[PDB]
Amino acid sequence: MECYRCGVSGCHLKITCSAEETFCYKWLNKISNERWLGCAKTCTEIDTWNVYNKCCTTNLCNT
Numbered sequence: 001m002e003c004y005r006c007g008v009s010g011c012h013l014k015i016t017c018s019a020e021e022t023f024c025y026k027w028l029n030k031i032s033n034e035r036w037l038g039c040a041k042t043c044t045e046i047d048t049w050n051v052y053n054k055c056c057t058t059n060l061c062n063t
Contacts, residue, residue, distance in 0.1 A: 001059045003039045011035050014060070024062035027053040037062050 003024035005015045017024070017039030025043050027036040031050050043055035056062060 001039070003037065004060060004062050005038045006035050011037055015039055022057055023055050024057070024060070025053060025055055026062040027051065 001017045001022075001024075002014045003017055004011055005013045007013050015038060018041075020041050021039035023040045023043035025036070025038060025040050027046075028034070029036075029050060030052060044053065045055055046053040054062070
């Protein structure tokens with residue numbers, strides 16, 4: 001599986017997940033609009049004053 005990740009060129013970059021990294025994350029800073037995307041072994045959904053994070057478990061799901 002792969003997930004999207006972000007760099008200077010945008011958030012369309014692809015990264016291979018290990019077998020244990022069964023999540024793609026999409027972590028958004030609600031204050032700065034920073035996007036943090038990738039593969040992870042653990043993923044907790046978050047919806048606070050400053051953070052939104054969504055978790056998903058299929059290839060390139062963190063659009």
